[PDB]
Amino acid sequence: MRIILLGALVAGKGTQAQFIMEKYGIPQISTGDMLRAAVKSGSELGKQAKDIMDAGKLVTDELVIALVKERIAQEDCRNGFLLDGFPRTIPQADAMKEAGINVDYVLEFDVPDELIVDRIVGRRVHAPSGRVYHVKFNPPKVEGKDDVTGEELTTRKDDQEETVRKRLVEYHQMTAPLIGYYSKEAEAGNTKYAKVDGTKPVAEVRADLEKILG
């Protein structure tokens, strides 16, 4: 099955990408996690991306479409995938359309703008695994420690408050047009569109999503 998770910053996309990944058995394709992984392995892409990432600027289209075509192309995206963080600009969305990749579901996670800087700045990451926690809203069972490996959680440099603010502008300009995009397509017959309330309990939203997919 193929699904795009679209949404505002911090709305909870990635926290759900996990669930959809097991339940419906498909690769989670996180451009965030992959650029961050390229960075912590000193791969060539990891030299381009880090300063941009860090800066709140979006990485280059020409580059991220390249990353993501390589990945869909691997034998596990064979029966579907869920894109988490691709597309982030109408450029990325048209390139996927031009390539002939039509997806089944587009799910929009909404959160009211007041929540966005709180969502991001209290967010701790168990770096190796990409396991995402919120200090206040979805905490580890042992503070500071990750629930599975016992290893300390960290904070991203782009989850630093004034970078969160630079991201929100870039978002509004860049990525906000894709809701319109995917709604015209769902109108054209091309996908299904649903919107989910990113403020409910991680629990409830999980349910809201089963009730959509199956």
Ligand X SMILES: Nc1ncnc2c1ncn2[C@@H]1O[C@H](COP(=O)(O)OP(=O)(O)OP(=O)(O)OP(=O)(O)OP(=O)(O)OC[C@H]2O[C@@H](n3cnc4c(N)ncnc43)[C@H](O)[C@@H]2O)[C@@H](O)[C@H]1O
**Does residue number 15 form part of the binding site for ligand X (CB under 6 A)?**
yes
Which one, 23 or 187, has the nearer CB to ligand X? Answer: 23
Phi, psi of 128 (to 5 degrees): -35, -40
Name which of 78, 109, 66 is nearest 208 in CA terms.
109
36 is catalytic: no
Q: Give the pairing of strands 105-110 and 131-134.
A: unpaired
**Does residue number 133 form part of the binding site for ligand X (CB under 6 A)?**
yes
Inter-helix orientation angle 44-54/31-39, to 10°: 110
**Does residue number 7 form part of the binding site for ligand X (CB under 6 A)?**
yes
**Does residue number 90 form part of the binding site for ligand X (CB under 6 A)?**
no
Name which of 71, 66, 69 is nearest 27 in CA terms.
71
**Does residue number 140 form part of the binding site for ligand X (CB under 6 A)?**
no
Q: What is the per-residue binding string for ligand X in 112-131, x denoting contact by CB under 6 A? A: -------x---x--------
**Does residue number 175 form part of the binding site for ligand X (CB under 6 A)?**
no
Out of 50, 88, 119, 206, the active site residue is: 88
Q: Which of 137, 190, 192, 213 binds ligand X (CB under 6 A)?
A: 137
Q: What is the per-residue binding string for ligand X in 19-48, x denoting contact by CB under 6 A? A: ------------xx--x-------------
Name which of 74, 75, 50 is nearest 63 in CA terms.
50
88 is catalytic: yes
Out of 97, 156, 192, 195, the active site residue is: 156
123 is catalytic: yes
Cα(107)–Cα(3) distance, rounded to whole angstroms? 7
What is residue 52's DSSP assignment?
H
Phi, psi of 207 (to 5 degrees): -75, -50
Cα(202)–Cα(133) distance, rounded to whole angstroms? 11
Site residues for ligand X per CB under 6 A: 7, 9-15, 31-32, 35, 52-53, 56, 58-59, 64, 85-86, 88, 92, 109, 119, 123, 132-134, 137-138, 158, 167, 200-202, 205
